[PDB]
Design goal:
This is part of a larger assembly, with 1 copy of chain A (754 residues), 1 copy of chain B (576 residues), 2 copies of chain C and 1 copy of chain D (77 residues). Chain A has 754 residues and is an alpha+beta fold. Helix content of chain B is 19%, strand content 22%. In chain B, the strands form 9 sheets. Chain B has a 6-stranded mixed beta barrel. A 4-stranded antiparallel β-sheet of chain B has the order 5-4-3-7, with no helix packed on it. In chain B, strands 13-21-20-15 form a 4-stranded antiparallel β-sheet, with no helix packed on it. In chain C, the strands form 5 sheets. Chain C has a 4-stranded antiparallel β-sheet with strand order 1-2-14-13. Chain C has a 4-stranded antiparallel β-sheet with strand order 5-9-3-11, with no helix packed on it. Chain C has a two-stranded antiparallel sheet with strand order 4-7. Helix content of chain D is 43%, strand content 5%. In chain D, α2 crosses α3. Classes of the chains: A alpha+beta (754), B alpha+beta (576), C alpha+beta (223), D mainly alpha (77). The B-E interface holds B 327-328, 330-331, 442-445 and E 27-28, 31-32, 34-36. β25 of chain A pairs antiparallel with β1 of chain D. Bound molecules: zinc ion. Chain C: Its EC number is 2.7.7.6. Chain C: DNA-dependent RNA polymerase catalyzes the transcription of DNA into RNA using the four ribonucleoside triphosphates as substrates. Chain C: GO terms for molecular function: DNA binding; DNA-directed RNA polymerase activity; protein dimerization activity.
């Protein structure tokens, strides 16, 4: 109940925390509410009169609607719902028309195109529900992707081009600064930022000019800030620098405390600057700062002067004619191939040189052919421009939903090593998804020298650069794989919440968030390989791993390969019998005969059997391997998923050890546990093995689970959150934990006196 | 014709009917073409049905073949023409007539009005068009209107797919379309008695009946809002066993508790319009109505639908978006004429999304609207070498046809923009680039850069905001499962799926989730308690047990599974 | 450097319905802002002079036909919308139009009551034939801007009457242009001309003077 | 300097999160106080509003201002 | 015509800054008069400012002055902040001479009869140990913002520096528009105007100045007929 939907239209004039609500919809939605207020203020005496008064849409009820709506949040949601950001809270504003007005920045999260999409609206009723919308699900509090930590409400597609244009620098623009000499003084300087505006309204100053002025309210750059003061600041102080008037107006949008930027506001830059703000400033600041970038971005997107027409879209006539010689030479070489002058490989290689010649020719024209100030290029230079995967996400969710932070610290010293941008004379490209937002298991000291960072630090981006100076090439960081928490995981092991940017809060259901963070791009060497890994199935094409360390002897049979490892023991030689030449050797360079090999190296390029490396290298390594494989697939498609998400899923695969024999049956929990062995099993098998029998029934193999559960006469403790959802109980996560649902709210004796 | 197998023996046809009507089809991507064709068969008939200004040769043959247009069977001359019928006196001496469909409802509620295009004393020929169909003008398909377009991003109101229109399109009824809805209700024999429809209703004021006739059906030409009565029907009821508090008022006010219950047709929630016609079928006289039915009456309601913010528009090239805003004609980017532009389309869709043709019919649209006269006296420019004669000169507002795979070529288009005759007082509004200096109608200052302007042919799409907006606070509840459902008088409830539950769990909002799944959907006792709580202003009550779960236990028990609730203290509980 | 010479407003004529107006002298960057400040007011708040509702004896609603006529009632309403009227009497008043026999009904066939006048009698309304009898009344009211058809359920008109969209805007098409002269030696100034065109219900001077009165009274920042 | 927040956003969550352990505690924190305030407006005596209320301020928006002012203390179970 | 309800309110941000709000208008009247107000306040209010100066010792030296840290440019825009109201309405010449080390302010300059400097504490330059300064100033009444004119382009006055003239007292102005409920429709204009002013005149008086020069400006058009019944706007 208390729900509705309609088609959505753009809301460029809205604040980030707001939404346009059709009056009629808001009327029927709040019907019961406006009925009480309509009777209290004695417009109608009995409730029956109030109902007919709203039903007939009497003109008097529109004033009572703004009063009940005020500061009463609503929940918007668009199907399909991929991540938790697919549902957010907004401040409802009554609007004319039958369409919902959605803030333009939230389109990224909802993946909401304005081609006619519809959005649903729900009305939180109780106090706890309203509070959850105001605090937990509010729009302006959720800015960062809960998968990569990257900002999502960052401007896009319109404001990008607009901001790009505003800050760009044009040579010889009207009013360009000139250091006049010997006849008059310099003409490019200006008294204050306001004066330049008066010179811009008049034909004197072009916003994209290279003029220089003295600012008294913006903060100067870091390097230039030391030379000028080094002791005081410029809240009332002044200083001069040479920048475009636009770059000035741009920096005005940022916070006063942030240092001057002075750059062409490239697409990539705005990500940097917005990222920095989230770390240094509270949420409300970033929310308001992104709101200001929207207005400016749009305004200048209109004055940008970007329109398509005959000239811009025109494809160069010369390109078509140049390819004629290009196609005749590629064909003329084909006529020589048949004659016998081909030489059989250079001819094929030479054709690529012909074909490559056209590619070079189009580049020879491309930027010279279309004037540098081309609107199609400007859009490019600025950077502005199903269920099968959701089937996998369902198994992901069902195997990790009960994974929630249950304590602040487990106090374990165990951890895992991060490469941390090694191979320098050079930062690793994947540090942002492996080292960022972690916590140190052991202190990090550079010898010889002082300890660079103390154990248990947040390992923010500023810390990496500080670490980079020391020349460090590895780091030990806590992880949910090594966490020793009896129930769930601990905050310190999990680390920083991607959404909040601070330490994860106890009660966060990191399991579900992990499954979503992984599932969303699933719809976006693909899903079969990912599903092959999480289900723990033997690789499609098996690849052998080294069973022992030593040198290697390589032999080539007919259509086969033989690989013998000469151990350094040196004991029984390890021989890997028959290996299809179709599945060629791995790479170090490419492996050759006589190279040294370690206890776990993959001998040939391919998918190693996870059950193989488990028996060989032990549980801790299988997790490292699987995460490396999964993250490599997503990395191949350009998807940024922090390792901790994948790790949450992997942790649930090694939780049980086979016994089957000192005990009745196998597959008892590691904590539950007379010798057992570590086990690797797929998510589907792992989730069906949960202790709750109605959770396993609602998931898969319904008939099977009941029969075995009825015989064993099992009893469900109703501990997991799935169960409580079915019977209507409070899920044991978030606001449902014991610690959080027993808070006693009493006013201090000191406050009541007032 | 060539046989399929005959293709091996010896060595525009690939285009469909909907596809062959997209001008500049060759330059648009194949995928965009099909998408554009689907949207042509998605348009709705407009009251005025203006023909496309830049089209292709197919419109004429396509219109008459559809069959919704009136074609003279034999050459002759008309005798009398009235909105009802047209009759032509053939030279042969025979006499033929044609009754014109007027405001007939289509399958999906679209209007099927025909218009007469001929006059008295007019000669006609065999196969010639006599009257215009719904979406035709003078014999060719008119699925939309021609509008002035500016391709500037206008301050985020046209953000990323949305569109902004002039208020003119509302004042001038250019995009206005009529829609007709049918309603039905019947009187039959019942188990208890016989259904009877009449003006008398058990409990009503004389104002709701103020629009009903004797029989109790709404009178023709009446205006009906949501919840009003269309047909007054009543069915037997008993035993009543009315509550004591109900009867005490019955005696106090002296209103006898009637023996029958009200089953009367009311207009659905969110619908409104005038009553066009009524179709009454009664068993009394004639009328083969199925066994049990004693009378039937159908009500036809129709409405003029002004183009509204939220509706969907689209061109023939696959571009579609919602009407994001409608700006007053005043504060609209307008040419130096003071000529406001109709709609403002954003440029962002274009980058590497090819849709190139959409820009071509925009320039050709301005050429066709303004007229041209090539400069061929001594020049005879090289670009017009391939051109046909006397196309050189054309007057203002002329129509143009560019068949798909051989239409106007690129070079010729450029030359046509060079010859672009003035507007009333000699002056040029569009350069050879198809751009012009537009004046921001809200600030007054011109837009610093030349903006592309032209005339494009766009369509009003099938699904409209009025039909798509839904809202519900409380309404009907399903029988087997108490979850809400919207039947008559829509009041349908939005459905909160598992994926939505996943997100709700991810946030940690335990209460919001419980509320949605228990007291908003399935709690037979909770939903009523929260409604009582809201009206009193008291705190929201504590949720109970979702009826879905209760039914679950019975389903397990029906399967011979002894489910036991197993409380910590009493150890055995019956839901009751 | 005060160059003080109060602005001068000059009438002019290009046609009967429209006529230019030229105001000089003015400061820099003042023409564009002032011009659109009047255009936005002209196109909107000039009072009419419009028709609210109509009533045809033979018809009860807009979606029927009249025996004999060529246009349906919905196509006649669309025609009736284009008519430009003018009324100097407050308090709605009704016109009449009765035509019989073959011929063509036009705006001239409409009999205006005392105090109103039809300014484009040449307009085509409907074409009648031998059997066609068109008896129609029209209610003229005075307002401004564009008002949607006031439905007869909001006002108790009754079944019979037909509400129609009303357009009170005597102004047809407005534009402007400025010829600011930047003088290097001395005396920078601006000068604009506006092009006001009306619907024949009032004159360009009448409209501009009405728009001027609105803005003048509206700029009450003195309080 | 974070300019004045509008309606729902005020007060900022950061300044609220200093008054409790987590964002989830803040929820229950203000929620139970909201039920407390609304009971006082009808009728185990009821307390509040400790802060001078607004024109028509909702009890939940009152409890948030109260928490921002440290006017009450809570204990987690 | 009778408009339902206009109003105008004022809230002061600082001593020389204030927000003005008009509520409510009739759509789309916000954008109509909005841009015309900012245009009037900025370029239509009479005020006096500096046109051109000349310094002793700076005749063909491009950028340096002896015995003072500040250079040519830094002092030109230092003076552009000088606010002085005058009724002479012609290029009067004030004079500033101070000897010895020390910081010169806008109070050291001797104002001729009719000119009054409003910012005495304004910093102008810092002096070297054992230095003296003598600068000539040309002040004339102004309107808006006139860029620095080319000195003569004629025979000449050797060693004459024209400077950008900030004639109007209003430093800068910007406007916004919002919609508020009229109890019937959501779309009703709300005009927000933001004016930062010189201490010559306050914002309240600065707005009325723009209101008078604008209402009398439109009086011409009203004079043509004066009986077309435009809009009442109530009392
Ligand atoms: Zn841990």
């Amino acid at each position: 109940d208390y729900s509705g939907r309609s088609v959505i239209v753009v809301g460029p004039q809205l604040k980030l925390h707001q939404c346009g609500l059709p009056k009629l919809m808001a009327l029927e939605l709040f019907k019961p509410f406006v009925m009480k207020r309509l009777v209290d203020l004695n417009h109608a005496q009995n409730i029956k009169s109030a109902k007919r008064m709203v039903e007939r849409q009497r003109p008097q009820v529109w004033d009572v609607l703004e009063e009940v709506i005020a500061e009463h949040p609503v929940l918007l949601n668009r199907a399909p719902t991929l991540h938790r950001l697919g549902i957010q809270a907004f401040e409802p504003q009554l609007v004319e028309g039958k369409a919902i007005q959605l803030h333009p920045l939230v389109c990224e999260a909802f993946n909401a195109d304005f081609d006619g999409d519809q959005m649903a609206v729900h009305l939180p009723l109780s106090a706890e529900a309203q509070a959850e919308a105001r605090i937990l699900m509010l729009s302006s509090n959720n800015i960062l992707s809960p998968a990569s930590g990257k900002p999502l409400a960052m401007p896009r597609l319109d404001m990008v081009t607009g901001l790009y244009y505003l800050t760009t620098l044009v040579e010889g623009a009207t009013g360009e600064y000139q250091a006049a000499t010997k006849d008059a003084p310099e003409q490019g300087v200006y008294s204050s930022p306001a004066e330049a505006i008066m010179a811009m309204d008049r034909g004197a100053l072009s916003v994209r000019a290279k003029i220089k002025v003295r600012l008294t309210e913006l903060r100067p750059p870091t390097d230039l800030e030391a030379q000028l003061f080094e002791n005081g600041w410029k809240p009332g102080d002044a200083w001069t620098a040479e920048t475009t008037l636009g770059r000035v107006m741009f920096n005005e949008l940022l916070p006063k405390s942030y240092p001057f930027v002075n750059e062409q506001m490239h697409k990539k830059v705005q990500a940097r600057i917005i990222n920095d703000l989230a770390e240094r400033f509270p949420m409300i600041v970033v929310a308001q700062t992104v709101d200001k970038l929207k207005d400016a971005g749009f305004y200048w997107a209109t004055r940008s002067g970007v329109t398509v027409s005959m000239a811009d879209v025109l494809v160069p006539p010369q390109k078509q004619e140049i390819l004629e010689r290009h196609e005749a030479e590629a064909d003329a070489i084909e006529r020589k191939y048949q004659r016998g002058a081909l030489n059989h490989t250079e001819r094929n290689e030479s054709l690529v040189k012909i074909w490559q010649d056209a590619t070079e020719e189009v580049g020879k024209a491309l930027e010279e052919f279309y004037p540098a100030d081309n609107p199609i290029i400007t859009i490019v230079k600025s950077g502005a421009t199903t269920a099968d995967s959701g089937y996998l996400t369902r198994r992901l969710v069902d195997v990790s939903q009960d994974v929630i932070v249950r304590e602040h610290d487990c106090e374990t010293e165990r951890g895992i090593n991060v490469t941390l941008a090694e191979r320098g004379p050079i930062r690793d490209a994947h540090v942002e998804t492996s080292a960022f937002a972690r916590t140190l298991a052991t202190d990090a000291v550079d010898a010889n020298g002082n300890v660079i960072i103390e154990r248990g630090h947040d390992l923010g981006d500023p810390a990496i650069d500080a670490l980079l100076a020391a020349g460090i090439t590895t780091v030990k960081v806590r992880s949910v794989l090594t966490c020793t928490s009896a129930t769930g995981v601990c905050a310190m092991c999990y680390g920083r919440s991607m959404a909040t940017g601070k330490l994860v809060d106890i009660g966060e259901a990191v399991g579900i968030v992990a499954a979503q963070s992984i599932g969303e791009p699933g719809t976006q060497g693909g899903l079969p390989r990912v599903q092959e890994l999480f289900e723990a199935r033997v690789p499609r094409n098996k690849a052998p791993i080294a069973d022992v360390a030593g040198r290697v002897r390589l032999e080539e049979s007919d259509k086969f390969f033989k690989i013998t490892i000469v151990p350094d023991d040196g004991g029984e030689e390890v021989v890997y019998d028959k290996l299809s030449k179709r599945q060629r050797l791995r790479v170090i360079g490419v492996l050759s005969d006589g190279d040294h090999v370690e206890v776990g190296d993959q001998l040939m390029e391919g998918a190693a059997d996870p059950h193989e490396v488990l028996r060989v290298q032990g549980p801790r390594e299988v997790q490292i391997h699987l995460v490396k494989e999964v993250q490599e697939v997503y990395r191949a498609q350009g998807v940024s998923i922090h390792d901790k998400h994948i790790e949450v899923i992997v942790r649930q695969m090694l939780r049980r050890v086979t016994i089957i024999d000192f005990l009745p049956g196998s597959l008892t929990e590691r904590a539950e546990f007379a010798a057992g062995r570590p086990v690797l099993m797929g998510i589907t098998k792992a989730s069906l093995a949960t202790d709750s029998w109605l959770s396993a029934a609602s998931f898969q193999e319904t008939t099977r689970v009941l029969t075995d559960a009825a015989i064993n006469c099992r009893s469900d403790k109703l501990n997991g959150l799935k169960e409580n959802v079915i019977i209507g109980k409070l899920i044991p996560a978030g606001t449902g934990i014991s610690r959080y649902r027993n808070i006693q709210v009493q006013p201090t004796e000191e406050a009541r006196a007032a | 014709y060539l046989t399929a197998d005959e293709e091996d023996r010896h060595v525009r046809q690939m285009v469909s009917v909907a596809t062959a009507m997209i001008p500049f089809l060759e330059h648009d991507d194949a995928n965009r073409a099909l998408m554009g064709a689907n949207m042509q068969r998605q348009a709705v008939p407009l009251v005025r049905s203006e023909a496309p200004l830049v089209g292709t040769g197919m419109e004429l043959r396509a219109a008459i073949d559809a069959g919704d247009v009136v074609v003279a069977d034999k050459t002759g001359v008309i005798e009398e023409v009235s909105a009802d019928y047209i009759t032509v006196m053939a030279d042969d001496g025979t006499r033929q007539s044609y009754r014109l469909r007027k405001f007939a409802r289509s399958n999906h509620g679209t209007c099927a009005n025909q218009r007469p295009i001929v006059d008295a004393g007019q000669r006609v020929e065999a196969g010639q068009v006599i009257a215009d169909g719904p979406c035709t003008q003078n014999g060719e398909m008119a699925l939309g209107k021609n509008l002035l377009v500016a391709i500037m991003p206008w301050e985020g109101h046209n953000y990323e797919d949305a569109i902004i229109l002039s208020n003119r399109l509302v004042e001038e009824d250019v995009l206005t379309s009529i829609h007709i809805e049918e309603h039905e209700i019947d009187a039959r024999d019942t188990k208890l008695g016989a259904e009877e429809i009449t003006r008398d209703i058990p409990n009503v004021s004389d104002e709701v009946l103020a629009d009903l006739d004797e029989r109790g059906i709404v009178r023709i030409g009446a205006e009906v809002r949501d919840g009003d009565i269309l047909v007054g029907k009543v069915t037997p009821k008993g035993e009543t066993e009315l509550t004591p508090e109900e009867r005490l008022l019955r005696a106090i006010f002296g209103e006898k508790a009637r023996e029958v219950r009200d089953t009367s047709l009311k207009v659905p929630h969110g619908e409104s319009g005038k009553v066009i016609g009524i179709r009454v079928f009664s068993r009394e006289d004639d009328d083969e109505l199925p066994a049990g039915v004693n009378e039937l009456v159908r009500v036809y309601v129709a409405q003029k639908r002004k183009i509204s913010d939220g509706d969907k528009l689209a061109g023939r090239h696959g571009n579609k978006g919602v009407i994001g805003k409608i700006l007053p004609v005043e504060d609209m980017p307008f040419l130096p004429d003071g000529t406001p532009v109709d709609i403002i389309l954003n440029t962002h869709g274009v980058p590497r999304r090819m849709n190139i043709g959409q820009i071509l019919e925009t320039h050709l649209g301005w050429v066709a609207k303004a007229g041209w006269n090539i400069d061929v006296a001594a020049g005879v420019p090289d670009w017009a070498s391939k051109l046909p004669e006397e196309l050189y000169s054309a007057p203002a507002d002329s129509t143009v046809a560019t068949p798909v795979f051989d239409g106007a070529q690129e070079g010729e288009l450029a030359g046509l923009l060079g010859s672009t005759l003035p507007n009333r007082d000699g002056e040029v509004m569009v350069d050879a680039d198809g751009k012009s200096t537009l004046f921001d109608g809200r600030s007054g200052e011109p837009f610093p850069y030349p903006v592309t302007v032209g005339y494009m042919y766009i369509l009003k799409l099938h699904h409209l905001v009025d039909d798509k907006i839904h809202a519900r606070s409380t309404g009907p509840y399903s029988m087997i499962t108490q979850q809400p459902l919207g039947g008559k008088a829509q009041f349908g409830g939005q459905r909160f799926g598992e994926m939505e539950c996943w997100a709700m769990q991810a946030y940690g909002a335990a209460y919001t989730l419980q509320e949605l799944l228990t007291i908003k959907s399935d709690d037979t006792v909770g939903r009523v308690k929260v409604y009582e709580a809201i009206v009193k202003g008291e705190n929201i009550p504590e949720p109970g047990i979702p009826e879905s779960f209760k039914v679950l236990l019975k389903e397990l028990q029906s399967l011979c599974l002894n489910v036991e609730v197993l409380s910590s203290d009493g150890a055995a509980i019956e839901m009751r | 450097m005060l160059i003080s010479q109060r602005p001068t407003l000059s009438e002019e004529t290009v046609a009967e319905n429209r006529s230019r107006f030229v105001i000089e002298p003015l400061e820099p960057g003042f023409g564009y802002t002032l011009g659109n400040s009047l255009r936005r007011t002209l196109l909107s708040s000039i009072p009419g002079a419009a028709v609210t509702s109509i009533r045809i004896d033979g018809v009860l609603h807009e979606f029927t036909t009249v025996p004999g006529v060529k246009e349906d009632v919905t196509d006649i309403i669309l025609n009736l919308k284009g008519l430009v009227v003018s009324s100097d009497d407050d308090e709605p008043v009704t016109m009449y139009l009765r035509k019989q026999g073959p011929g063509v009904v036009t705006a001239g066939d409409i009999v205006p009551p005392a105090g109103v006048t039809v300014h484009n009698p040449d307009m085509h309304i409907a074409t009648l034939n031998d059997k066609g009898k068109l008896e129609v009344e029209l209610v003229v009211e005075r307002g401004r801007g564009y008002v949607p058809a006031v439905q007869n359920k909001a006002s108790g008109a009754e079944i019979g009457r037909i509400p129609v969209d009303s357009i009170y805007s005597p102004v047809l098409k407005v534009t402007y242009k400025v010829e600011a002269t930047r003088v290097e030696q001395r005396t920078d100034f601006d000068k604009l001309i506006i092009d006001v065109e009306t619907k024949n219900s009032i004159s360009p001077r009448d409209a501009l003077a009405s728009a001027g009165g609105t803005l003048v009274e509206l700029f009450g920042l003195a309080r | 300097a974070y300019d004045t927040p509008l309606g729902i956003t005020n007060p900022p969550i950061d300044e609220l999160l200093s008054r409790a352990s987590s964002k989830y505690a803040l929820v229950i924190y203000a929620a139970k106080r909201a039920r407390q305030i609304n009971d006082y407006y009808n009728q185990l005596e009821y307390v509040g509003p400790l802060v001078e209320p607004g024109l028509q301020e909702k009890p939940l928006s009152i409890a948030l201002r109260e928490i921002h002012g440290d006017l009450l203390e809570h204990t987690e179970g």
